[PDB]
Amino acid sequence: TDFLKIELIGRDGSHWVLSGPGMGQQGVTLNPNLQQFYDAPVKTLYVPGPFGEEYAGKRVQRREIVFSVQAYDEDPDTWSTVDSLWRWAWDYDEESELRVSTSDGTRFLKVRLMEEPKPYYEKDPHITADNPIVMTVTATFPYWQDEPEELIWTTLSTEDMTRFPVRNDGDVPVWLKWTLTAPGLWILPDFSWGNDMYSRGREDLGRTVAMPELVAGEHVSVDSDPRVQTLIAVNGMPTQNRWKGNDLLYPLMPGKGAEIPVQLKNAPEGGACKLTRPRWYSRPWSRPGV
Amino acid sequence: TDFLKIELIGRDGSHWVLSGPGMGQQGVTLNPNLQQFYDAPVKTLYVPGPFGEEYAGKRVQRREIVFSVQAYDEDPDTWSTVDSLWRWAWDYDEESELRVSTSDGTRFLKVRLMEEPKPYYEKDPHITADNPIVMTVTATFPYWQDEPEELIWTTLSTEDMTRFPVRNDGDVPVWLKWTLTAPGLWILPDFSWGNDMYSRGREDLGRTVAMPELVAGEHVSVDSDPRVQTLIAVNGMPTQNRWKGNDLLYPLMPGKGAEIPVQLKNAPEGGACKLTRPRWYSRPWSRPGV
Amino acid sequence: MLSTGPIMETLTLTVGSAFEIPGWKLRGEYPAGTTSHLVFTDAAGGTLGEFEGTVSAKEIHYLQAPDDVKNIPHGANFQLFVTYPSMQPQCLYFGTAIRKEPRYPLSTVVSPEDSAVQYKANFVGQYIGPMWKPMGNGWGSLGIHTHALISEAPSMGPNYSLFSSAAARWLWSMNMDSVTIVVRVLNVGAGKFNVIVCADYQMQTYLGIQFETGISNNKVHVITGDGPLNWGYQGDAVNNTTANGDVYTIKYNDLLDTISCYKGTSLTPLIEASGLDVPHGEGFRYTGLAWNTALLSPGVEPTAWEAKDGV
Amino acid sequence: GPNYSLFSSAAARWLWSMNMDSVTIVVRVLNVGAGKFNVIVCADYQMQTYLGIQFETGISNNKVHVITGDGPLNWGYQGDAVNNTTANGDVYTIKYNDLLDTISCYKGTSLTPLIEASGLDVPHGEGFRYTGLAWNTALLSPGVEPTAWEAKDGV
Amino acid sequence: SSGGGPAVVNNYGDIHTANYDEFYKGQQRREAQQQAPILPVR
Amino acid sequence: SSGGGPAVVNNYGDIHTANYDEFYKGQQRREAQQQAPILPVR
């Protein structure tokens, strides 16, 4: 339909339109009954209690998508070319992009082959030149995402401050990324946003943490997501070694936003900072949530 | 179909055409619904992570092909001859070739009887003289193979150097084999090709390993394949003891190739170097990729 | 669905082919003065193309030269507007332009092997760093000497607490056979300092320029490799008195098969050699330095080191 | 060079493009006759406008020129001509420096510019980073032609 | 297909084919690895 | 008939009905038989 478009950008850069307007132009269409495609799989936890079981929390699980495509052409040689190109568009080690475009925008999922594809019918595929490939792909990162929102604040003063507007319009908490120039001592916000995960929801409402004093040439990236180390210098200096066990603890909870403050001190040149706010969603399409 | 031809070269050298042009001339045809025949079975490993599970690598699995053949003939006696010949074409200990020829060339698979064949219908086979045999064969090496490329370099000089042109056109890495004459000191390339499985993908871009000095009659086979010992002296001398912990670590990564340098020094009677490069694929047919 | 809206559509582009939208696809009733325009923008919203349709009584026809659309990438988003006379533009279709054509990935991508490299080191931090691999005398054979008595920056040399000679191999390799080395060096005593290019993985064979200084042995040699700590003199030496903070450029030109050394900003080679019997090519593009002194004190040592592909 | 069985003057462009404006071209050539060989810098995708260094070999025109291109096979000269004899195996380094807006040619190992030019009116930036070669001979025999070519981005 | 059959039996874990002998032997091997070096030679 | 049902489940071995407590007690009894006569009386 014209309300939904599904595309695949392979690991080699090839572009396919499985469903939607212009689907099947490259020879591959999407068969029905695709699973674990819409909602992010989450399992909830329960402890024994006096009234049965008590809620203990939730964990989001990786997506195990199983879907069939149909590769077709008029002649078997061109069908063989199409099938080979489709196979080349996938890999186990590196992930290809799967984009869904609706009136809510375009959200992409990074997927890799979980196991070998299951191609063709019972007979040889050159008889038909129109054969299905069943594919079991997996999303290690299970959330659908959009292009992150980026803001830049530069200054020439030795000491300065700024406000970054931030707002999570998605379904799930997002983890902020910072890029900070050197030299200079930065103070970055780590607001709880009312999140009570550490039982400090309103104690950490205005939490600010000071990064270690960066030496010349030691521009740092401070990624708060748990997949990656928090502090990483671009010159290879061990910055987090000088941070005494400090860390950024809180994601940007959904529906929360404010003018988070960034402070720069002891910057003789006057540095710059960049804030990246990811746009993660648990669904290929969803109306914005206030 | 004429686009795809399937043959079997038995352990006794018998040639059978199961599918394609000339199928059934030897009395045996191939039945549909053959499994684990096209894509190499690969299992992916996943380890717990912040957002579910994180990719941890892939392991290729041995192929288990379950396929049916039909042995047919007009008279029961000659049919029995055909069935006996088909059974004689197979074994458990020794492998036989399964060759697929398409517009992309001919690629073979070494398969052996995984278990006893399941022949015939429920009634007396001589009634119909046209009976199916269910074969469960296995491929210990799961990659479809082409004939490996062999290059020879012979020199009469005491010290010389050559450039071997090498290129991996397949979708999987391959391991090179060298046959070096003696006496003489050889230096062989162990280029990483950017492969970063020893955390030295860039440090070992132009890595060369110096084999131990070879005395007269100590011709060596230097195979990078993990299945076999790297250095094997033809006369039985322990030549890996003079190698000081050095080894050939890297395969030929897909899509990579160059003129790798081979050096010979201290050779009173010259020397000969043979390079064997395997040509491995994960599919019976596929278009070239780069 | 109370209000009129566009239809999500797609466009097809091909290199060397004229982009064309047939009139019968953009049908309807269009009075006189109606104008249609197609706008192509990118991910940031910047307009990368705009074309005018040929609106007729009942059809709209688009036809553009291939050079007009060759700059439109795949994934660029289009918007087709129709405008009736005395009215605001009304978007009919919007979507994405896909390119149905042969795909050339190797043209767009650049491999790491196909990239000129540039390396730099200054030793001002008083530590060796992970980019230098000791050679000849094994791990821990290198060191940094401050030279605080004179107004000079720290320099790299052998670990004189253990050795009087050493070598260092720059961890990564060059991508070209031709290579330029720029060294700012200090002469604080007698010794020999080798700048080594076209080296193998273990620095067994290489070309090099040797700066030797002493009581009466201030000269420059062209050397070939016999191991990371052994070398062979090639050609005649050239007298050269090295002073503190002297900048030397060692350029190896592959097509000329010539290794030359220029002192300071001189346009004429201080030393030059050609046609040396040393392997070149892939596997023979590592570089490094070496030091050898009779006494256990620094001789000629590099304060600043720089390397770059090509000459 | 040109395929003299059916052609006399021929131009070639490198398939890929430089990523920066400054460029260095090291060419080892042979002089097996009389003709003109142009090293082409800062060309477009059709080699319509470009800078170049032209080596002319002949009885009286053993020279080097700085050229500005009008099409792949037609060009005009800029500045004077520097006398230069080219032998077999001669290596020439043509460097275009964007900061100085200069085009220079060096011979062999010496770092002094054999020829130089500055301020030439050609477009630069994106779409004008293509290099190439050109050969123009009056006869149907090879003149001055490259046996080795290498390009490096930047100077 | 996968959800609701053997592919979810795999998620269940050791409900179908799984023996006690090698599990006990592996536990014993792990305990032996832990305790063997610290056991006296007497 | 036999191949492909419970008669091959028996070949599979302890996939269906098989208890943990009895197996553990049997292993403990075997270990006790091995080690009891050599334990001291003190």
Short overview:
This is part of a larger assembly, with 2 copies of chain A (290 residues), 2 copies of chain C and 2 copies of chain E (42 residues). Chain A has 290 residues and is mainly beta.
Task: Give an overview in words.
This is part of a larger assembly, with 2 copies of chain A (290 residues), 2 copies of chain C and 2 copies of chain E (42 residues). Chain A is mainly beta. Helices cover 4% and strands 43% of the residues of chain A. Chain A has 1 helix and 19 strands. In chain A, strands 1, 2, 3, 6, 7, 8, 9 and 10 form an 8-stranded antiparallel β-sheet that branches. In chain A, strands 11-19-13-16-17 form a 5-stranded antiparallel β-sheet, with no helix packed on it. Chain C is mostly beta strands and 311 residues long. The longest helix of chain E has 16 residues, at 20-35. The A-B interface holds A 12, 41, 59-62, 76-77, 80-81, 84-85, 87-88, 92-93, 112-124, 126-127, 138, 140-143, 225-227 and B 1, 3-4, 19, 32-33, 38-44, 46, 49-55, 58, 102-104, 283, 285-287, 289.
Helix content of chain A: under 10%
Question: What is the tally of beta strands of chain A?
Answer: 19
Indicate the proportion of strand residues of chain C. Answer: over 45%
Strand content of chain A: 35-45%
- SS class of chain A: mainly beta
What share of the residues of chain C lie within helices?
under 10%
The helix/strand series of chain C, from N terminus to C terminus, equals EEEEEEHEEHEEEEEEEEEEEEEEE
Oligomer: part of a larger assembly
DSSP, total strands of chain C: 23
Order of helices and strands of chain A: EEEEEEHEEEEEEEEEEEEE
Distance between the termini of chain C: 67 Å
Order of adjacent strands in the largest pleated sheet of chain C: 10-13-22-15-16-17-18
Rg over C-alpha atoms of chain C, rounded to the nearest angstrom: 33 Å
Radius of gyration of chain A: 24 Å
C-alpha termini separation of chain A: 29 Å
Topology of this structure?
This is part of a larger assembly, with 2 copies of chain A (290 residues), 2 copies of chain C and 2 copies of chain E (42 residues).
Chain A: E1 5-9, E2 15-19, E3 28-30, E4 42-49, E5 52-60, E6 63-72, H1 76-88, E7 96-102, E8 105-113, E9 118-119, E10 130-139, E11 144-154, E12 160-167, E13 177-180, E14 185-189, E15 208-210, E16 220-223, E17 231-233, E18 257-265, E19 272-281
Antiparallel strand pairs in A: 1-2, 1-7, 3-6, 4-5, 6-10, 7-8, 8-10, 9-10, 11-19, 12-18, 13-16, 13-19, 14-15, 14-18, 16-17
Chain C: E1 7-13, E2 19-21, E3 35-41, E4 47-52, E5 54-55, E6 60-64, H1 66-69, E7 77-83, E8 90-99, H2 105-108, E9 118-121, E10 132-135, E11 142-145, E12 155-158, E13 165-170, E14 179-187, E15 191-199, E16 207-213, E17 219-225, E18 231-239, E19 246-253, E20 258-263, E21 271-274, E22 286-292, E23 300-309
Parallel strand pairs in C: 1-8
Antiparallel strand pairs in C: 2-6, 3-4, 3-7, 5-6, 7-8, 9-23, 10-13, 11-12, 13-22, 14-19, 14-23, 15-16, 15-22, 16-17, 17-18, 19-20, 20-21
Chain E: H1 6-12, H2 20-35
